[PDB]
Structures are given as C-alpha cells and as structure tokens.
C-alpha cells in the first residue's frame, strides 16, 4: 500500500500555469529553511528550482510517467526528464 511522502520519492509536481514537471522530494539540510507545515521541499528537474508543495500537487512517478513523461517545449523540461530517468538521486550543485 501507499505511505506518506519521504525524501527521495520521485514525482511529477504540478504548479499553476505549468505542465506536470519532473521532480523529487528533497531532504532539509541542517541549518536550512523548513517548509511551511504540511508542505514538502520539491526539487524540480531540469530547471533545478525549489518550491514548497502539498500532496494534492504531487503525482508519484511510476504511476504517472506514461501520462506526463513526454517531451515538452518549456525551458528545462526535457533536461528534467533525462535527470529523473537517468540520475534522479544526484547532486545538482
């Protein structure tokens, strides 16, 4: 069965005025800003941006990749698809 979201989960994260985007749940580093309550830190593949998102905006990857894992023209997108398929636990420093 399903559990709660945890650092390392792979997902597609929806944000207003964007397509479902390759993304991961991040850990919080020591000293680093916590997310609001009930939100998680979301690291977007390709663009390398962060955001703070509740589950209603989080589609787990395996289930969803057939729907949302397709090329898109937006900046970062197709890099992002590469990352989540090929090295999704990497350090993108």
Swiss-Prot record:
Residues 7-64 form the PWWP domain. Belongs to the HDGF family. It is found in: Nucleus; Cytoplasm. Widely expressed. High expression is found in heart, skeletal muscle, ovary and testis. Overexpression is frequently observed in hepatocellular carcinoma samples. This is Hepatoma-derived growth factor-related protein 2. The lineage of its organism: Eukaryota, Metazoa, Chordata, Craniata, Vertebrata. Interacts with HDGF. Interacts with trimethylated 'Lys-36' of histone H3 (H3K36me3). Interacts with trimethylated 'Lys-79' of histone H3 (H3K79me3), but has higher affinity for H3K36me3. Interacts with IWS1. Interacts with H2AX, POGZ, RBBP8 and CBX1. Interacts with histones H3K9me3, H3K27me3 and H3K36me2. Interacts with DPF3a (isoform 2 of DPF3/BAF45C). Interacts with SMARCA4/BRG1/BAF190A, SMARCC1/BAF155 and SMARCD1/BAF60A in a DPF3a-dependent manner. Acts as an epigenetic regulator of myogenesis in cooperation with DPF3a (isoform 2 of DPF3/BAF45C). Associates with the BAF complex via its interaction with DPF3a and HDGFL2-DPF3a activate myogenic genes by increasing chromatin accessibility through recruitment of SMARCA4/BRG1/BAF190A (ATPase subunit of the BAF complex) to myogenic gene promoters. Promotes the repair of DNA double-strand breaks (DSBs) through the homologous recombination pathway by facilitating the recruitment of the DNA endonuclease RBBP8 to the DSBs. It comes from Homo sapiens.
């Amino acid at each position: 069965m399903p559990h709660a979201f945890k650092p390392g989960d792979l997902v597609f994260a929806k944000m207003k005025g964007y397509p479902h985007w390759p993304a991961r749940i991040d850990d919080i580093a020591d000293g680093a800003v916590k997310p609001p309550p009930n939100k998680y830190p979301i690291f977007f593949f390709g663009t390398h941006e962060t955001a703070f998102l509740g589950p209603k905006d989080l589609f787990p990857y395996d289930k969803s990749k057939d729907k949302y894992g397709k090329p898109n023209k937006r900046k970062g997108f197709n890099e992002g698809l590469w990352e989540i398929q090929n090295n999704p636990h990497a350090s993108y420093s």
